[model samples]
Target: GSSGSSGTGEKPFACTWPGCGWRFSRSDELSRHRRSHSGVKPSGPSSG
Candidate 1:
């Protein structure tokens, strides 16, 4: 879990999983990374 203090243009979302240190700028991005740990495939970006 993050410190709940993001959205300041800093990549704070860190993947706590071993050997998978992925960071993201948005919370949604973090969720996507978390899905990987659960064997869930992330969807493609929207055109809207």
Candidate 2:
């Protein structure tokens, strides 16, 4: 499993599922992580 890159190396996305306690750097990463709960794959990051 890979955590997306925030470009700042900081985890910003937190899992909505209880007891998961996983943090991701990008929303896409979090979406992917949701597969463990939702049984589906979802799919971004933009900063300036």
Candidate 3:
């Protein structure tokens, strides 16, 4: 038995928007976070 150079693989989804450093576990989640920047932000970040 030997254990050496064990690596992990995970899929990551990231936002394509410029200056928007965002990442999501799923591709769909990015839709809201992406759109949030436009409509959801009325006053501040994620403002109601």
The whole-model C-alpha lDDT of candidate 1 against the native structure comes to 0.74
lDDT of 1 by residue, 3-28 (tens): 77556657888877788989997888
Q: Can you tell me which runs of candidate 1 are displaced by over 4 Å?
A: 1-9, 39-48
User: Which one is best on TM-score?
Assistant: 2
Model 2 pairs whose backbones collide: none
Q: Rank candidates by TM-score, best first.
A: 2, 1, 3
On a 0 to 100 scale, what is the lDDT of residue 7 in model 2?
Answer: 61
lDDT of candidate 3 over 1-48, digit per residue (tens): 697554853438777777877887677687667785654433565554
TM-score of 1: 0.51
What TM-score does model 3 achieve against the real structure?
A: 0.45
Candidate of highest lDDT: 2
Clashes of each: 0, 0, 0
Candidate 2 residues 1-48, lDDT tens each? Answer: 698766666788999887789999889898778878954332325433
Q: Which segments of candidate 2 are over 4 A away from where they belong?
A: 1-9, 39-48
Q: Which stretches of candidate 3 lie over 4 Å from their true place?
A: 1-11, 38-48
